[PDB]
Design an enzyme around this catalytic site. Structure first.
Site, mmCIF file in Angstrom:
data_model
loop_
_atom_site.group_PDB
_atom_site.id
_atom_site.type_symbol
_atom_site.label_atom_id
_atom_site.label_comp_id
_atom_site.label_asym_id
_atom_site.label_seq_id
_atom_site.Cartn_x
_atom_site.Cartn_y
_atom_site.Cartn_z
ATOM 1 N N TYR D 105 0.807 -1.211 0.000
ATOM 2 C CA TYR D 105 0.000 0.000 0.000
ATOM 3 C C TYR D 105 0.844 1.266 0.000
ATOM 4 O O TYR D 105 0.304 2.362 0.178
ATOM 5 C CB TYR D 105 -0.951 -0.012 1.197
ATOM 6 C CG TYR D 105 -0.402 -0.756 2.387
ATOM 7 C CD1 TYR D 105 0.730 -0.312 3.048
ATOM 8 C CD2 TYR D 105 -1.014 -1.917 2.843
ATOM 9 C CE1 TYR D 105 1.236 -0.996 4.132
ATOM 10 C CE2 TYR D 105 -0.516 -2.606 3.926
ATOM 11 C CZ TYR D 105 0.609 -2.141 4.568
ATOM 12 O OH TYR D 105 1.112 -2.825 5.651
ATOM 13 N N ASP D 106 2.154 1.140 -0.195
ATOM 14 C CA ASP D 106 3.034 2.290 -0.305
ATOM 15 C C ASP D 106 2.897 2.922 -1.687
ATOM 16 O O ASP D 106 2.038 2.552 -2.491
ATOM 17 C CB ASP D 106 4.477 1.876 -0.029
ATOM 18 C CG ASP D 106 4.890 0.645 -0.814
ATOM 19 O OD1 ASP D 106 4.500 0.531 -1.995
ATOM 20 O OD2 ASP D 106 5.604 -0.211 -0.253
ATOM 21 N N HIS D 142 -4.707 -4.325 -2.167
ATOM 22 C CA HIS D 142 -5.019 -4.133 -0.756
ATOM 23 C C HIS D 142 -5.188 -2.663 -0.391
ATOM 24 O O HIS D 142 -5.019 -2.295 0.775
ATOM 25 C CB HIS D 142 -3.944 -4.777 0.117
ATOM 26 C CG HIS D 142 -4.066 -6.265 0.218
ATOM 27 N ND1 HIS D 142 -5.204 -6.942 -0.160
ATOM 28 C CD2 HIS D 142 -3.196 -7.204 0.655
ATOM 29 C CE1 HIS D 142 -5.029 -8.237 0.038
ATOM 30 N NE2 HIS D 142 -3.819 -8.422 0.531
#
Ligand SMILES: NC(=O)c1ccc[n+]([C@@H]2O[C@H](COP(=O)([O-])OP(=O)(O)OC[C@H]3O[C@@H](n4cnc5c(N)ncnc54)[C@H](O)[C@@H]3O)[C@@H](O)[C@H]2O)c1
Ligand SMILES: NC(=O)c1ccc[n+]([C@@H]2O[C@H](COP(=O)([O-])OP(=O)(O)OC[C@H]3O[C@@H](n4cnc5c(N)ncnc54)[C@H](O)[C@@H]3O)[C@@H](O)[C@H]2O)c1
Ligand SMILES: NC(=O)c1ccc[n+]([C@@H]2O[C@H](COP(=O)([O-])OP(=O)(O)OC[C@H]3O[C@@H](n4cnc5c(N)ncnc54)[C@H](O)[C@@H]3O)[C@@H](O)[C@H]2O)c1
Ligand SMILES: NC(=O)c1ccc[n+]([C@@H]2O[C@H](COP(=O)([O-])OP(=O)(O)OC[C@H]3O[C@@H](n4cnc5c(N)ncnc54)[C@H](O)[C@@H]3O)[C@@H](O)[C@H]2O)c1
Lengths: 324, 310, 271, 268
Positions: D105-106, D142
């Site tokens: 999720y970066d 995600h």
């Protein structure tokens, strides 16, 4: 014996209000015949039955030669089944679970509570022998077919199967596929378990809070309409007391948790002491051992007699059965 | 009658005696008491929605369209004015009760079965909502799988619209599980249902997923005016249904449904005490069934034998 | 009306932007003299009992015939009823000219396939699980219900009740591709009725999507009578933007080809 | 390994190769491993510090008892960092992937794609599926923090994973479609990872030979056990082991990452 009884009485006297209310509810369910016991691996281990970590570590020794997370609990038997053959899997199953073990006192206390049903994930027959000894017949359901031809009203439902048909891996749920396809492979058994949970009072004994089956049951319970079911009682017998955060989380999840370690202090490895503490508390509450004040005496007598106020006269012979 | 029909009768009567007989009463039995059939409600909804006046899917769609358009209030008001009518209890309700069923599952929203149970002096814990499952005061259930109007004549208390059927497994998990468990652990007799009924075929689809021989084939009391075509009977009996055809049972008109239901109900009831033995082989088989368990005992008191033969 | 012209403008912008995919149904194939499904349902019913259909009957009667008569009889009827040289109707040419990104068809015939082949617009035909993994082209002609390319058998198609029952289990890749294309393109439903089983299944799937997380598909309703207002609103709130040929033009009952041609050429011109 | 590199090169040249970037690649960039943040959650609940169940539960317990605000505060303090993109990012992008699917999720992959000149229509939420303006996709299955370091924007607790399909229908469909239509190479994923095993469980439903077996680049220090390799290749993963590919140090993972990636690139 006398010292233990006195200490149990003092423990009950200093017991918390929520725990005493839980004990009252369980005893009322037992008196009503609506108490179902959900027995896990703790009660089986109390009789030194082969633990599952042992089975998984022999599987891992065979796979890699060097003898375990929760996911590993299902993955390792699966890897042995796939890489190896089903024959070796079944051979290990037989060599390990083909034993005869006694019915520890916890089995006797569970059966002495007069449970309407005994659901269990244990593939051993300890509970079956325990109910056989007491003279009360429990229709044993360990396979899909057994559900249809159930002889009696009381069920002993082994949700994960057992080895009655044979010490073969297709009779039980141990590997990852068994759990993945449990709903597809055990439709009738799963439906029966859920119906028993919905219609009865469930006490979880022998289960860890983070157990796979307990979490699956709580996931299902989430789907139910709010207040449409009764929160199952969870007898927690882990060595150390329960953290307040975990207790609140799992009580909001739908459990009424009775922590054995929080009632009686015991050695880290004295699991039987905690099991006995909880079960003896319940039984003695059933056996009127904890009623001391005249107030409780009047309450008990009234609870026994008031329904007979509808009748004009009660035979003195009947009064015996009225007081058990 | 036909041998298979007599075998069905014997199995049903044995289950009734053993207390393992469940009755799945459909809308036909309720309509037998002149209760308004659902197609009347669907036609009323269609007439309100469009100029004037149904397929199986339309049964669920037209109520759904009327809901979405005219409001839950309008849907509920139509249901209330159409269903808030008292009706008598049929002789077939009393026949079903006299069969001594362990449970009575029903897809009817009416209280006709409730009224018959109350009149016949039969105590059933009525399960029409999700909360009723845990609060069941008795061990014998009168299970209204599609709800009813006991709480009120509201459209949210019953399963009528298409959305209700779509989300049934999610809105009635406890009731659906109870119905499936009762089906698995009991002998099921379907009465008041069409063979092409939505609920019957959904139940058959569920049964499809079960083990090959892990369940007992439910008995289906078919009371349509014409005899079932052999092709349809072959198709539905291979799906897990043992069909007792009323049209083949007796000769009847096209619209005398009460006689058709009563034929099967009476044929079942009068066979309750019938040994069903005519030849000597059957008589000896029955006597052996009565006497074989006693072979374990060394000697049997003669005065005791009267209890062996009731 | 503002609604019709605005919907057609949206369709034309989707066409120009290149994100246009056509969901072609039964009516388009029926135009070019192709047996309607209820004709085969009636054939199966006649074979079963000798005389002659709701949504449930559509699936059950073929299922009953397959169960009792057998798979061989089912395939024989399917072959003798569907093996035929048929002409690509003008609607095929119009749809192809609209430059669709993909063609998703519930029809198991080859009509759209032949139209694409002879019209110069090339599509990778996806009618079985094996097609999805290995398709040369990036634009798919997706026959969701299969076809008879491998052979005129019922196993290659979705007709019976059980075929629809186990479609998700039996056609996971095809269903995933269909839903992805619906999500990532603009769908024009041509040849379907409002009460169609397939259309209602797609609407059921759409109901589970995040609110306003998708573009409502365009439904070309080339039916005889004009759409009722209540039904129109009901199916417009179900995520469908409907262009009706019974209100766009005026014609008689059997002018189905006229309805198709009008509702397609008017959109083409609007682009 | 020769056939696997041949297939990957063929897919890269044709344009039908996709990369599944796990938490390992971002960990390469010193992005905190998930178990570190799980320990952080376990420290503020029980005071002192990991199976998949606990992985998804400790965040769930903290969210339930502590509340959403504390969860999001830990997330913000834990992910409000900027990390350089690894040479692994550049090596992965050097193959010109058709799509890149990552559970991270970066924003490491987004910045890497920007810097290298490639353009992917980054998809991380439901509404992003329809609005995507390219066939090329960067599927963050995600979620992401682009809308903010809020707990509800990512999938990192038990509830999120349980309701993933009901909350990410479009994203799940797109991921499955991309996997089916492309040849997938897994990079920086645990061979016993939860997401990888869910993917394998879904894949076992598809009919045999109806999908290309994905490549799994295992970069653990020790060589993959023969039993584990055989089991996970029967499941449907072609495992290429960097540990056995070249001898390496236990804590030097970048060496094996680069070994596998550059052995693939030089195989072009
Ligand atoms: N990593 C592992 O899971 C693993 C592997 C091998 C051995 N072990 C050791 O096995 C021991 C017990 O079994 P477990 O690990 O499955 O426990 P567990 O925590 O997995 O199971 C806990 C539940 O089982 C009951 N229980 C646990 N140990 C028991 C015992 N020795 N006797 C009676 N009841 C018991 C408790 O009542 C508790 O509710 C533990 O001390 C554990 O450290 C653990
Ligand atoms: N659109 C409609 O379905 C519609 C509308 C109005 C009238 N009708 C006609 O009126 C009757 C309504 O019944 P249905 O079509 O819903 O039956 P159905 O076939 O839908 O229901 C089948 C079951 O209901 C029972 N049943 C059918 N008609 C009954 C009646 N009049 N009284 C008591 N029990 C009955 C049968 O025993 C059968 O098992 C049918 O004959 C039907 O043709 C139908
Ligand atoms: N389905 C039945 O049981 C039945 C009964 C009587 C008549 N029909 C015939 O069905 C047709 C339409 O009714 P329906 O929608 O229920 O049928 P259908 O089930 O074939 O619907 C197909 C859809 O395709 C389009 N279509 C219909 N007929 C077409 C044609 N001849 N050529 C091209 N496109 C066509 C319409 O949109 C129609 O809704 C009429 O021609 C009618 O005569 C069908
Ligand atoms: N029963 C258990 O599950 C258990 C018990 C004790 C220890 N452990 C584990 O030991 C672990 C040590 O790390 P791990 O190898 O298991 O990681 P991991 O299990 O998180 O594997 C993650 C993946 O990312 C890659 N990766 C791992 N560490 C990396 C790093 N420092 N830099 C770059 N890439 C890396 C790995 O090669 C692997 O592919 C802890 O995370 C802890 O969970 C697990």
């Amino acid at each position: 014996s006398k010292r233990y009884g006195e200490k149990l009485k003092e423990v009950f006297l200093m017991l918390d209000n929520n725990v005493v209310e839980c004990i009252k509810e369980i005893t009322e369910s037992s008196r009503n015949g609506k108490l179902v016991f959900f027995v896990g691996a703790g009660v089986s281990t109390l009789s030194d039955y082969p633990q599952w970590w042992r089975l998984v570590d022999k599987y891992h020794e065979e796979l890699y030669g060097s003898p375990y997370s929760s996911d590993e609990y299902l993955r390792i038997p699966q890897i042995f089944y796939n890489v190896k053959g089903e024959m070796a899997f079944d051979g290990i199953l037989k060599d390990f679970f083909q034993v005869d073990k006694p019915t520890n006192p916890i089995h006797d206390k569970i059966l002495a509570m007069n449970p309407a049903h005994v659901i269990t994930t244990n593939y051993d027959n300890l509970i079956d022998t325990a109910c056989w000894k007491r003279g009360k017949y429990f229709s044993v359901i360990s396979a899909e077919e057994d559900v249809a031809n159930a002889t009696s009203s009381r069920y002993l439902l082994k949700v994960h199967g057992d080895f009655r048909k044979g010490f073969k891996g297709e009779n039980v749920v141990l590997k990852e596929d068994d759990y993945l396809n449990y709903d597809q492979n055990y439709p009738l058994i799963s439906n029966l378990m859920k119906t028993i949970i919905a219609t009865h009072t469930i006490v979880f004994i022998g289960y860890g809070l983070g157990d796979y089956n307990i979490n699956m049951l709580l996931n299902w319970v989430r789907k139910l309409q709010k207040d449409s079911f009764h929160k199952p009682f969870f007898i927690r017998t882990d060595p150390s007391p329960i953290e307040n955060e975990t207790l609140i989380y799992y009580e909001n999840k739908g459990l009424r948790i009775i922590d054995a370690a929080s009632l009686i202090d015991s050695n880290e490895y004295d699991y039987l002491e905690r099991y006995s503490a909880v079960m003896d508390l319940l039984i003695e509450s059933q056996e009127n051992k904890f009623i001391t004040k005249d107030d409780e005496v009047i309450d008990y007598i009234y609870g026994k007699i008031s329904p007979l106020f509808a009748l004009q006269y009660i035979r003195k012979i009947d009064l015996k059965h009225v007081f058990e």
